[PDB]
Symmetry: D3
């Protein structure tokens, strides 16, 4: 039993795909443990969430995009939730993400890619603490 951190990104709201994405995880039988709606996340939270990317050329565009509309942060719980939700998410790159995955069916850009999911136990703990410090 693991918990992972998922963000629904501002592009899902712009495109009205919030329920679609959440529904895919719900149908796979993962349970919401906590959830927060952000009309706009503070840039500092975003910078912390993506701290590993601070030296990448896309860092600033990525932070601007993540504060460009609402976000929902969600903690999901389930056996092997971290790896499983990552497989449902699909690859970052639109040339690679597989039909059947969230990104494979729905996303067409490497940046506006609808959804974040923690990639490991270490990072899940970290990201959960950022979005749900309580």
């Amino acid at each position: 039993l693991q918990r992972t951190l998922v963000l629904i990104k501002p592009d899902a709201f712009e495109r009205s795909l919030v329920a679609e994405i959440m529904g895919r995880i719900e149908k796979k039988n993962f349970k919401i443990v906590s959830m927060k709606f952000w009309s706009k996340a503070p840039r500092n939270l975003i910078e912390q969430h993506y701290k590993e990317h601070s030296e990448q050329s896309y860092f600033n565009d990525l932070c601007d995009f993540m504060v460009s509309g609402p976000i929902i942060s969600i903690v999901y719980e389930g056996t092997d939730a971290i790896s499983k939700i990552r497989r449902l998410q699909g690859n970052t790159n639109p040339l690679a993400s597989a039909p059947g995955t969230i990104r494979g069916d729905l996303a067409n850009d490497i940046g506006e890619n609808l959804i974040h999911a923690s990639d490991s136990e270490d990072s899940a703990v970290d990201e959960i603490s950022i979005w749900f410090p309580e």
Copy 2:
């Protein structure tokens, strides 16, 4: 432009219909402006939410049901959001709710009925202050 308060009820979690219900409202172009997940809503909030029914025969069972699993409280915004979302919701009574409505398609019980929606401007304002004080 109006704001209305929606609760996703514990039966929606139990039957995995949370996204289905939220999706119907999202597809109608209504925007979330607040949302809170409650693993278990406090009895007192529930009793205040339904204070109008406090002397009704079904009150205790209603309150018991409403604390029997998680709920999501959401404020939705849109032109005439209150009446329009009430229309989406459908009649409380499963003998009357129309196919095409949330309850008409999905609910089979007058009590386990998936969703709450504010029924007027004044009750919307009240319910919003209960869930998002």
Copy 3:
């Protein structure tokens, strides 16, 4: 709590709408308690099922249609199942069936209308004994 008899008609097989129709009833939380697949229903069962219409102008065409492909006969159980599933079904006449109903959304003919549902307690009991003797 009631039991009702539903037939999935041959047009549903032809148009691949079997799961779509059964899904609408399943999503309304009704439970299957019996079900039989008929690659081709016997003429006599069909004629007994529709015995009330035996002198109607459409009887032979109705019976011919009903043996023109497979059918599934299902008994569904739930509180007020009879009237509620009738409500899901929609009006026989495609000029009257409401969007949101099975027929309102999917059927375009008064005859090729996808689904049978028992119309009362007494007819439910009768139809159930025909298909599941």
Copy 4:
């Protein structure tokens, strides 16, 4: 058997609901007999299409909206296609359109309302000749 003229409006493209809308009509078993994609419809065609509304207060905004993005014009064929597709469409006014209808489920504005459908035999014939001369 009848032919009716449907326009998929620019809001459907903007909100990615083109297939959703066409799908509802396809599932009702209506057949496309003509279809044209317009990256931008000519003002004059739009003004002729809505010539009945030319003196209405909303005319210019309506025409402006209708040239604000792509449209698809489609001729659909089926028994009683005109009235049946009008029934699928739903009321212009989002306070009145029924859940289960295209507008009842998807539209939130009296103007940005996703779809046009001919309202009678005579207007169908007229509209068809405008879009498919």
Copy 5:
């Protein structure tokens, strides 16, 4: 043209996924040849169906689960139906079943995995005879 045996398992009924699963096979254009609804299958039928697993540690839990609610048995017919329905089904293991498959989208446990499908011509013949001995 082949026939394969499919079981809709008790978890599909518990979770109201019966139509969802049948719909996926129906949309792929496979035809129902026979179908039986079981309010509860007799344990002996289950033990016969899973006879190859009789010495596995999960055998008894598997039999208990399969008699824990209803089952629908179905014979589907179509060109290469056996291998094709297996690919739609998805892998047994939730760490492996691919998004887009029935198990990949819907199942989250190696045991409660919604659906059985015959894995070969030899086993299809066998399983069809168990569920439809006529």
Copy 6:
């Protein structure tokens, strides 16, 4: 930014899968640039579209099938649209096309396979000129 040529084939009309297929491409955020409905495409257009297959044993059956009912021709535009729509389409062979793809979920025959999509920049230019010579 690329344009690709898609045909919705007569089997999609016969099976009422037109919107289903178009919807999958629409949901991936590709834009229609041009579109033409053909009550029946002229056999010569079909023969030109499939000119590379003229010596294959299936050539005549393929042309007969393509004129057997309506077709919609569509030009779709988007970053890497050609390769991306090909991945959504799925493999020609029903023993290979993956669940989650259009063919993987919906097609059960190597010939009646619902959808054409250009396979390269060179062929897209070519096919666009055939269906939209303007």
